[PDB]
Ligand binder design. Sequence first.
Ligand SMILES: OC[C@H]1O[C@@H](O[C@@H]2[C@@H](O)[C@H](O)O[C@H](CO)[C@H]2O)[C@H](O)[C@@H](O)[C@@H]1O
Length: 528
Amino acid sequence: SKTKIELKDNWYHLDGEKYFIKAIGYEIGARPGQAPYEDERKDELELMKFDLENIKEGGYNTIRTWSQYSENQLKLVQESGLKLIMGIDIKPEEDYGDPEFVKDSEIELKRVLNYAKKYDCIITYLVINEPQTDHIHSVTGKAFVDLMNTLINIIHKGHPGIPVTLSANAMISDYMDESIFDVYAYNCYDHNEGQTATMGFKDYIKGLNELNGLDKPFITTEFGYSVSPEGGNGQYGSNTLKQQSDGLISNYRDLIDAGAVGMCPFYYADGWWKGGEKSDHSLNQPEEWFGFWGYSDLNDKYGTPRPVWFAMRDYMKGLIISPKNKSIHTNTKIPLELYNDKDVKKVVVKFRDKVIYSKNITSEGYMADELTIDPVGIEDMELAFEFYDSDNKIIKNESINILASKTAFELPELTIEVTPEKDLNEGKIASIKTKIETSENFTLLDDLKISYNTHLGWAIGSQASVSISDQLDKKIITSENFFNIPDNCWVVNASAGISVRYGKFTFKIHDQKIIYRGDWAKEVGRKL
Ligand SMILES: OC[C@H]1O[C@@H](O[C@@H]2[C@@H](O)[C@H](O)O[C@H](CO)[C@H]2O)[C@H](O)[C@@H](O)[C@@H]1O
C-alpha cells in the first residue's frame, strides 16, 4: 500500500489529506572540490545521511533536485522520511528536435523510472530546468513541446500516480504554456527589477497563475539570494547574511500570497563549482554563494548553517495560506487556512490587541476555518497571528495586512496600451502609454515604473522612472514612453506599475502585456 496523490482544488493531496510541500533545493556531489555534472558519478551515501538528517531538523519535508538519483540514493531518501521532487537532467542547451537526443532521453528516463517507480517518496518529476528563450526560438517551440510531451507521457506510463511539471524561470519563461504539465511551476527571484519592479513579486507571479488558468496546483521550484563578497548586480549577488535571511522570508510569504501550495527555497549548501573552478570560492561569483550552509575551506565536507537557516526553520513551523497578505476583502467573513507542524498546539489572531480568533490545534497539518471582522468604511487591518506550543509559549508571530470592507469599493487602476499591440514585426520602435485612474482616499506615491523586458537572456531590457508630481491633482494620469525594439527580441513583457497607500496598507497597481514577434510562439506560447 503506497502513497496516493491527487490534485484538486489546486492542492497536492497525500492519501486524501492536503500536503503543503515544505521543500529545499538539494544537490549532492557539490561540496568544495566537486563538480556534479563533470565528475564520475558516485552515490555519496555517507554525506547524504548527514545532509538529509540536517534537512529534517531544518524543518523541511521534501527535497528538490536537478539530476536523477540512483536506486541506492533513493533508498536512503525513502528511509529518511523525506519526500522527493526529482529533476531529470535534460541538458537545456541540446537540440530538443534532434532525434538522437530524444532517443537518448527516452532511454535514460525509462531506465530511471524502471527502479524509481518502487519509491513512493517521489511526489513530483521535474522534466527540465530553465529553458532559455533564444534557444527555443533557434531549435523551434515545436521541438520543445514535442519533447515535453514525449517525456511527460513516458513518466505517466512509467511511474503512474506522480505529477510531472518543469522548473521554468518566471522572469524569462512568463510567456510559456504549462498547460501540458500536471502542475504549474516556476523558479521565482525577486530582484525588484523588470517585471518585479512594476508588479511586485506577489502580483507578478500571481498574474502568471491567473493567466495560467487557476486550474492546477502552483509550486515554486526555486527562490533565494546570494551572499557573495562581491559581484553580480543589484540584489543578484552581494547580499549580507541579514539580507539573505530576510529576503528568503519575504519571498516565502509573497509566493504563498501568489497562491503557491508548494515551496522549494533555493539551495541547502553552496557549490564552488557553479562559478568556474570547483576548488576556488570565487569572491565575485554569485552562483557560488546561494547556500543556507557554507563551507569553511576546501577541506570542509560538512559546513555550518548561515542565519537564514534558523529563520526559515522557525518560520515554517506555522504557515498562513489564507488570508493572504495584501489581499482585499469586500466581505465580513475571511477564509483562514493554516499548515502547522506538530509543535503548534494553539493559534490566536489579534487585531488592535483584542482576540478575534482562538483555535486549539488538535491534529497537525492543514486546517481551515473562518475569521469574522467588523470593518468600518474601508479599513486597513494588520491581523496579528500567534502560534503557541504545548507550554503555551509563542513560537511564531506573523502579521497579515488586508484592506477590508462590508460593501464593494473602487480602487485606482492602471492600464497600458502598447505599440505594436500584436506583432513586433510591425515596427522598430515601441511605446507604452500608461493610464492611471485615481481614486480619492487612495494615495499614489513616488514613481510609476515602466519595463519593456525584451527577454534577451537575463537582460531585463529598458526601464524608466516617471515622476507624476505635476499630475497629482488630476483624475486621469497619463504617460507615454518609447523604446527601441531589438531585432533579435522574440517576445516582450511590457509592464508598468505604481505603489498605492491606504492607511498602513500599501500595494502596487499594474498592467502587463506579453507580445510576440511573428508566429514563432505558435506552439510553446500560452493560449487563450
Ligand atoms: O546547483 C543547483 C542547480 O542550479 C541550477 O541553476 C539555478 C537556476 O535554476 C536558478 O534560476 O538560479 C539559481 C541561482 O541564481 C541557479 O543556481 C542549475 O541550472 C543546475 O544545473 C544546478 O544543478
